[PDB]
Design a protein around this ligand. Structure first.
Ligand SMILES: O=c1ccn([C@H]2C[C@H](O)[C@@H](COP(=O)(O)NP(=O)(O)OP(=O)(O)O)O2)c(=O)[nH]1
Ligand SMILES: [Mg+2]
Ligand code: NA
Ligand code: NA
Ligand code: NA
Ligand code: NA
Ligand code: NA
Length: 325
DNA sequence: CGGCAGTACTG
DNA sequence: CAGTAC
DNA sequence: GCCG
């Protein structure tokens, strides 16, 4: 990370634009900051900047000011509202729109939110676990959680394949939450298991709150909730579970393993090749309009393994650790 | 000019 | 649907 | 914000 002074100044602006809802500008900063982080040498020329992909004149100028002026004047013109929008949007379930609305309504603190804001069920849970959801757990605990889910799953069907994905699979030392993918090699015994699984996990008091769980739908694909391991010193942890048909195992695994940036890059590439990649499948011959919107369903390509996805995209396979973008 | 990933819940 | 999220 |  030879462009540190540059990044921590840009990360400030990135977050500022993000919480304010200027999503694409924030994306631009995100990519540039990214490029900066994974680069070999400090940059010295505003020609040495434009060169780095993800950095144009606009961005270059700002790094220059960060090197020469040793500071970015833009940072001093950030709305005083940003810290509060950040505070608000860090409540699970509240995004930029809700944060801006609360701010516009005069709310400035979580105390204000707690006592006067109309919260959705999800936001109330997010607020209740505000600090907890901002904390990462040692990967070891993520193991205990994956194991807890797997145990409950395999309880009514030992054939069920359960695997922790996300940051865990990419080998990170700490995890923001636990992402568990569940499927079954017989390609059918995965149907309508959420009902049973979630119920057992609730019986033992493991699950404490549900955020997203359309259980009245037998086609439910994901469960997003909160759990807590037994014993003292335990914090509530975010738990995500997806149940996919074996036929989509590779794409689901690839998707759920991420990283998010990596997935988007993969999908953007697939798109340039007339293909479409999703958590369900990799498709080819996908018809699209001038707006890049899928007009034609295309054809689903066989992808029994992640390697296959990379291969079909003409990419060298990458271990999960090599996808931590 | 205009896309920037593709998808799944919630209310 | 807009919002939020993975 | 960047880039095709
Ligand atoms: O915008 C997103 C978010 C997530 N994902 C995929 C990739 C990601 O690794 C996976 C799980 O999402 P998390 O939000 O749980 N992120 P991750 O587990 O990588 O990191 P963290 O340790 O913060 O949870 O879902 C996307 O494709 N797009
Ligand atoms: Mg995760
Ligand atoms: Na470049
Ligand atoms: Na939020
Ligand atoms: Na969030
Ligand atoms: Na997650
Ligand atoms: Na529900």
């Amino acid at each position: 990370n030879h462009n540190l002074h540059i990044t921590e100044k840009l990360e400030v602006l990135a977050k500022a634009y993000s919480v304010q809802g200027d999503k694409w500008r924030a994306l631009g900063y995100a990519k540039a900051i990214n490029a900066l982080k994974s680069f070999h040498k400090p940059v010295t020329s505003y020609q040495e900047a434009c060169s780095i992909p993800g950095i144009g004149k606009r961005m270059a100028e700002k790094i220059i000011e960060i090197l020469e002026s040793g500071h970015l004047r833009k940072l001093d013109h950030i709305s005083e509202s940003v810290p509060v929008l950040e505070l608000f949007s860090n409540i699970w379930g509240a995004g930029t729109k809700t944060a801006q609305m609360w701010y516009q309504q005069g709310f400035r603190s979580l105390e204000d939110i707690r006592s006067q804001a109309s919260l959705t069920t999800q936001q109330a849970i997010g607020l209740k676990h505000y600090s907890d959801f901002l904390e990462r757990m040692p990967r070891e605990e993520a193991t205990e959680i994956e194991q807890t889910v797997q145990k409950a799953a395999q309880a009514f069907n030992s054939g069920l394949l359960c695997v922790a994905c996300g940051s865990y699979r990419r080998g990170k030392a700490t995890c923001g939450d636990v992402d568990v993918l569940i499927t079954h090699p017989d390609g059918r015994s995965h149907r309508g298991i959420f009902s049973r699984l979630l119920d057992s996990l609730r019986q033992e008091g493991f699950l404490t709150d549900d955020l997203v769980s359309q259980e009245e739908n037998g086609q439910q694909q994901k469960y997003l909730g909160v759990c807590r391991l037994p014993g003292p010193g335990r914090r509530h942890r975010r738990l995500d579970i997806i149940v996919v048909p074996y036929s989509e195992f590779a794409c689901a695994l690839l998707y759920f393993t991420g990283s998010a940036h990596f997935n988007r890059s993969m999908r953007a590439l697939a798109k340039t090749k007339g293909m479409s990649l999703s958590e369900h499948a990799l498709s080819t011959a996908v018809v699209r309009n001038t707006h890049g919107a899928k007009v034609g369903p295309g054809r689903v390509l066989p992808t029994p393994t992640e390697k296959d996805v990379f291969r079909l995209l003409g990419l060298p396979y990458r271990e999960p650790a090599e996808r931590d973008w």
